[PDB]
Amino acid sequence: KLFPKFSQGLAQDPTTRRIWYGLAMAHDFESHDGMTEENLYQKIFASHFGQLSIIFLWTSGNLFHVAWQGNFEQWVTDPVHIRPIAHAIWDPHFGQPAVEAFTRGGASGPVNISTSGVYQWWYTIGMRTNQDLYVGSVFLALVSAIFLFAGWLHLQPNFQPSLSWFKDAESRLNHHLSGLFGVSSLAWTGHLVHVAIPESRGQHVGWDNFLSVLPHPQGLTPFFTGNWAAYAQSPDTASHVFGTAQGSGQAILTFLGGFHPQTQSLWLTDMAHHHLAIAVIFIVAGHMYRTNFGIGHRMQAILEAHTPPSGSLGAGHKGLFDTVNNSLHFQLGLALASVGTITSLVAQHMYSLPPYAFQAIDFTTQAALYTHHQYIAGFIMCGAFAHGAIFFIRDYDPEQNKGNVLARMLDHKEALISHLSWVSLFLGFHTLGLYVHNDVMQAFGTPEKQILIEPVFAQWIQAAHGKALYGFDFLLSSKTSAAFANGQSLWLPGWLDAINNNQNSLFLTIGPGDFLVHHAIALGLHTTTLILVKGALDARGSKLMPDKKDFGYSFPCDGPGRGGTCDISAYDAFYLAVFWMLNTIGWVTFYWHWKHLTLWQGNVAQFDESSTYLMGWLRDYLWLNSSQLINGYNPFGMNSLSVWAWTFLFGHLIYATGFMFLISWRGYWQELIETLVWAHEKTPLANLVYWKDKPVALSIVQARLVGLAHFSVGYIFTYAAFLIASTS
Amino acid sequence: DIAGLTPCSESKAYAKLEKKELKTLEKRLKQYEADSAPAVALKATMERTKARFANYAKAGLLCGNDGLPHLIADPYGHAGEVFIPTFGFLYVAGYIGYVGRQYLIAVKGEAKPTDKEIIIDVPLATKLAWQGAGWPLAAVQELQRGTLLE
Amino acid sequence: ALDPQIVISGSTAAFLAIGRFVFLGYQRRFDSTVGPKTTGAQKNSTIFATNDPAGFNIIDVAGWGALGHAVGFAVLAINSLQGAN
Amino acid sequence: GPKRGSLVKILRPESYWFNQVGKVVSVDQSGVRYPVVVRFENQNYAGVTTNNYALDEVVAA
Amino acid sequence: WLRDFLWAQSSQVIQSYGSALSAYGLIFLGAHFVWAFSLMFLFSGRGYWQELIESIVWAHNKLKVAPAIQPRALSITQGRAVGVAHYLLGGIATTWSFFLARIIS
Amino acid sequence: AHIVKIYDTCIGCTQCVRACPLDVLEMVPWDGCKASQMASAPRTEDCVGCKRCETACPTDFLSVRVYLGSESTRSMGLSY
Amino acid sequence: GNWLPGSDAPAWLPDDLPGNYGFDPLSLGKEPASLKRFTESEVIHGRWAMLGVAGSLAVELLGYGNWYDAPLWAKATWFGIEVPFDLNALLAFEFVAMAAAEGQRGGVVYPGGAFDPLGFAKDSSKSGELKLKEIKNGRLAMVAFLGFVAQHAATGKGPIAALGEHLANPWGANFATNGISV
Ligand SMILES: CC1=C(/C=C/C(C)=C/C=C/C(C)=C\C=C/C=C(C)/C=C/C=C(C)/C=C/C2=C(C)CCCC2(C)C)C(C)(C)CCC1
Ligand SMILES: CC1=C(/C=C/C(C)=C/C=C/C(C)=C\C=C\C=C(C)\C=C\C=C(C)\C=C\C2=C(C)CCCC2(C)C)C(C)(C)CCC1
Ligand SMILES: CC1=C(/C=C/C(C)=C\C=C\C(C)=C/C=C\C=C(C)/C=C/C=C(C)/C=C/C2=C(C)CCCC2(C)C)C(C)(C)CCC1
Ligand SMILES: CC1=C(/C=C/C(C)=C\C=C\C(C)=C\C=C\C=C(C)\C=C/C=C(C)/C=C/C2=C(C)CCCC2(C)C)C(C)(C)CCC1
Ligand code: SF4
Ligand code: SF4
């Protein structure tokens, strides 16, 4: 009868809470009034479209302003000594010298420097003028409108799909593997061959003439002939200059390895062959599940067949087909887990093997990106583990999964939790113990007494990969190894050359300071997983509260009685888990930032010597590289690092409000409000105004979220200001 | 040598870390007479600090480009760095743990056990203390016998 | 170099004649055990309808030759490279 | 029911003493459902040393 | 404050290593540690901790090493007291190491 | 309002009625238990959900449960 | 006679099996479904590796060939004579040949009919006495072939040449001058 339209219960709430929950309840379909599986799936589908339309519009927006407000064309001509423009600024709040200050580049007013690496992205892909950016902006905007269209389209009763269709998993897998993965990477490879490669060779190929231009001299003869080697006949020379004819070859598909020496990025020929190769594996593999032809696998049959003899895995995977196909949260958990891993995967491979020409020369961009994807990966992981327990509560069928791997999982969960506890306490005690030991020796002027363990195991791996520093002589280090002799005339010359250039990021040199920090990160991993896993497995029931599953995923507590039950819900478990996310990726991003900062600065001996103790982090990382940042203004004058320092403090202030909502809880605030609501009602003149919605204190769960949110935002923004301002 | 790092017995930086620390204390010792109290301390520290460096050079640890001794943690040039100590711990920790096990179980059957966690039966504990010397031989035999697990 | 007309026709025939006369008592019997369903209960029986002794549909052809050509193109392709161990 | 003072394992899964031992105080000879009154050495969270159980939620061992 | 007071003045505490004042650097870091350590107690609730303790207790019982005095998470009140206590001690001790190393050097 | 239920494990020791601040529960005759009486929740529209009732219950597990549900002016403890 | 004196042979190995000396400590054949499988694959491994050995002895036994240095030519070379091609041709006509004949095992130990023309399996009372000898010449070969691979990776040498090196300097040249144990 009032908004929340989707909840009678919340709509009848007389207070301001109705509002808050209404905002908070909006996307939870299963909890709305008179909901069905059909409406659930259909709303989810439409929502996916909605997301896509926002994404395409967002991307088009970037291209739009780079083309309209940027210096894209000044960059292409001189990428090394021009700062890429993101956007113009029109701020009526700025003072006279502010407008002078922010006018960087070739700009006719105040501008901001892009640290997204979209320049080098574009530029490496083939984008040459503002025109190209405009056309792409129009296109993707058109795709946005199309997606919006499509959302409302399959909302009508004629175009409403049936639940059976949504449950056709085999078909979606076949199509996504073959088409979405296979075809689209094949088509990209098409783009690299037809546009990117020629663009790097200095021949501008556009919509109007591609069809008329030969990418290879004897094109499409090798292809059908099976003389594929001709496509790798003459690669670009070692003196090739990117985007110019000088030193350019004709090959379209190679396995060279290493980098394009002047740009220091992967070879677009290697990238072409890569996308093409995977494309084939995807296309062949995408014909694996049974649909409407009779040929193909059964998922159910595969899963149910995989039960080992002598019941060492119980009933194996029997019943998982149904509990997965039914459970949406399960699918989102698997998806988020995989997506989180690959997000960090991307982050860790991109920095050490950059793919873009004249990236990695851009320090700030690289730092910004690598922080970006690791934090995104962290949040995504916590979320994976957050729809973990939502499954465990709402979705699991105890009878239908009897004695399976899943039920057996629940069975020995105390073992799992307790052994994670062991693994985290071990690390926590020893690593901290060895650091603080290292500090005390530093303090007393005896650094020779430090406990510095050399990372022999990683140093071994680097040796097996062909770095020769450590002199183990294994695999790709040793010249008398089959592994060496096999591919020595393939790509190893490009590889080995790149691994041993220590001015690049590829498999950096490692010492005892590396050793400690990785075990700090391991502490990060294991503990966060302890919170999340514990929260997932005890979502259903515990000894304190056996009937927890009757309440659901978020609840304040179960009262003060029998000891006290604050932060008992799996919700709260995930909440607690976010703090470790934050702390852990905080450590990882620092690790990253410094070990590069000292590389770029030209003194890696700063890192190796101060990373072995924590004051070293405090003094040589934090205290040193904020010098310029905090100076952005002083009583004497100003410079260009105004916004970062403003935002630095902004983040800190957000960070401390969070503490407010986290530490102080409801009873104080409500009674505060209780006196205020009397105060209003017997204040004359003001008497004549009264509220419609009774003023009430935010909930516990509300307080829980609002703290967390402020904390995270402050975290991110503060670092971002630091990272960028210092690296720049 | 191992991971290409130099031995402390030879390395230059390590031998220049000797010099700096010693030549910090000899810039202090000037400001005092030779008969005085603190001069006997700034001489004794030096003697100890100069002895300390000598005793890693004789130990033969690997010192890096840093000048600091790094450690080796797997196999046999540098056993004593970790591989021997490691057992030291697992023993004395296993000692403590198994004594604590034999105490709690030895109390368990005595009407109210909780009193013995607070007003600890010292002459029980000090007998279990010595018994806990031969613990791995008991710990193994108990894993065999099958009284170790619930 | 070998000729491109003998190996593709040879490898395709070497996997079609393999599929025609060996792998059927292995293929058709976990084709009947496997029964695709989702939480309870259209297959084009017109494309499968074949006037054959043992019943070889249009998909079996485009599946068993796919080995043959993934063989044929793999054979010809690597004959091009000079990979010396 | 069980004999008074006998050592009995609990088999009610939602109990604080589940799979744990207790002693029988008195089995009420009436039409009551949970007649077997058990007392334990260790309390639960709610400061309680004693509870009532049915005949299928005890096993004398 | 951020720059001219905090940042500039913390100079002598942050390089106090290798001197007579190094104890103040150690206490500088230790006081941050203990301050931050309080936040675990302040931000959380004993519901989590008690279940954690359930699993650990399992592990003990498995090896016949369970205590008679039944291991219980701190009360909500004690959680708050420990929190505020470590918060104050950390904060105050950090300012303490700061000033004294600063003003002495 | 909040939901309050009493399960059959009730002994009828009456602590949960005697503890309530808003008089939601009452004692009724029954035939199940040694005390010949069981707890009941006929007035849950006045239930605040403060969970004294639960804290007061001696049974294992508790034989009163309060499920915090749709919230109304009374359940939110308002005097304004 | 069981594999370790004293020890009791498990419940699952009936000794009406050929060559059961009661060896399954890891209890891999506990389940009879999984046992019937291994009784089969044992015999096949047995059979191949018996040819495998017999073959890669005969190579270097009378001619200056060697089983490690045989594939060198990737022109093949049987008994000193030339050959009928190359790589692709052998793969294809080995794939089909094997894939067909192993494909048609709709798994048996003693299929007979074709495979026993000369007619030994026959006379029940001695049929078992061969199947022992089958699996024991089977095992002894599977061990020997591993023995042929193990010694190759240590040295260069080659079975009959290693045997000849050991006969010259037995005390000197043996397996404590390589690295299985240092
Ligand atoms: C009737 C008859 C006959 C005949 C028959 C025939 C003539 C057949 C044929 C058949 C065939 C003739 C077939 C073919 C083919 C197939 C398939 C199925 C294919 C496939 C392919 C593929 C799969 C491809 C792939 C790829 C791509 C596309 C891309 C890149 C490259 C690659 C390679 C990867 C005879 C006389 C004998 C006998 C009697 C009867
Ligand atoms: C050698 C070495 C190493 C390595 C190591 C490793 C790899 C390990 C593993 C390990 C493992 C894998 C383990 C496992 C375990 C298991 C278990 C299962 C356990 C158990 C335990 C128990 C049962 C205990 C008991 C007791 C006692 C005995 C006494 C005290 C008390 C108690 C009760 C605690 C390194 C390189 C590092 C270093 C150098 C040396
Ligand atoms: C675009 C283009 C191009 C290119 C292309 C490429 C580079 C690729 C393609 C590709 C494709 C397009 C495809 C591929 C593949 C496919 C497939 C389709 C396969 C399949 C397979 C299967 C189906 C099999 C099955 C089976 C059976 C049935 C039986 C037994 C088992 C197995 C599994 C064997 C060119 C330049 C020419 C021209 C222009 C356009
Ligand atoms: C990321 C990016 C972007 C976007 C992109 C996109 C979203 C795209 C899409 C799409 C596209 C741009 C596509 C295209 C396509 C094309 C085609 C597709 C063509 C074709 C042609 C032809 C002539 C062919 C034919 C044929 C044959 C011959 C045989 C077989 C069949 C067929 C039909 C295939 C932008 C720049 C804005 C920004 C930066 C980055
Ligand atoms: S959360 Fe607030 S209310 Fe619920 S228990 Fe913990 S303290 Fe009492
Ligand atoms: S408290 Fe538990 S037991 Fe005592 S009356 Fe209320 S319900 Fe029945």
Ligand code: SF4
């Ligand atoms: S919750 Fe508080 S109010 Fe609602 S019933 Fe139980 S006791 Fe009476």
